[PDB]
């Protein structure tokens, strides 16, 4: 769909009023199927490894998140449609320049292709960027065709701060999701009993990311 109208008339006000935005049928059935095929090709060839945490301590990572992930730049062979999805995400964000809060977005992480392989695996309640590592917007694309949440679970439950209700996001096929990465949106991935795929990106605020890099580079 046209990036300008979607960004300015839907995504921007949605994020500024709620901090969460859902865009269903983002790319269409075809492109979604190609992205799913590429993700399953990554899975089949053993590209996924245990999802990690910002701060590792005595606990095993699988007690916190049960997904296995890999990182995609978008230009790798066999990942072309993932690159197209990433470029679409970037196009929307660029069309949101200077309208999402006070943030000045100039970059993002690579794409995290994540798989919860059923068996009740999930992600405990957590905040994506609690201590200001520069991430200001979390963007997720779901590509699970035939997903039935009432049986397979895997719902992303977000507890937006100050709201009388929480937001349940089913990992529906072709769904795109935006939400503030900071403490305003704690969230959990409820247990999944089927193979659940997602592709996540974290967009950086320029100043906060600069400060975070300064802190990291100085010890």
């Amino acid at each position: 769909l046209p990036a300008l109208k979607l960004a300015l008339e839907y995504i921007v006000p949605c994020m500024n009023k709620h901090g969460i935005c859902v865009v269903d049928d983002f790319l269409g059935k075809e492109t979604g199927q190609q992205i799913g095929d590429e993700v399953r090709a990554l899975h089949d060839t053993g590209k996924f490894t245990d999802g990690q945490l910002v701060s590792q301590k005595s606990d095993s990572s699988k007690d916190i998140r049960g997904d296995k992930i890999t990182w995609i730049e978008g230009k790798e062979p066999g990942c072309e449609t993932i690159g197209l999805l990433m470029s679409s995400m970037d196009d929307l964000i660029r069309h949101c320049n200077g309208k999402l809060g006070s943030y000045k977005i100039n970059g993002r992480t690579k794409a995290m292709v994540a798989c919860y392989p059923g068996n009740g695996t999930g992600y405990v309640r957590h905040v994506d960027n609690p201590n200001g590592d520069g991430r200001c917007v979390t963007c997720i694309y779901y590509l699970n065709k035939d997903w039935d949440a009432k049986v397979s679970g895997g719902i992303l439950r977000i507890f937006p701060e100050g709201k009388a209700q929480f937001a349940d996001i089913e990992p529906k096929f072709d769904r795109l999701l935006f939400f503030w990465s900071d403490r305003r949106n704690p969230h959990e991935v409820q247990p999944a009993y089927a193979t659940r795929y997602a592709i996540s990106v974290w967009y950086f605020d320029a100043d906060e990311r600069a400060r975070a890099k300064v802190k990291y580079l100085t010890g």
Partner: peptide, 19 residues
């Protein structure tokens, strides 16, 4: 307690993708 023990890891030093 320390919420960073539960936050998803992203590369810190690295490069980052510039838009």
């Amino acid at each position: 307690l320390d919420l960073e023990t539960l936050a998803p890891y992203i590369p810190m030093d690295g490069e980052d993708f510039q838009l």
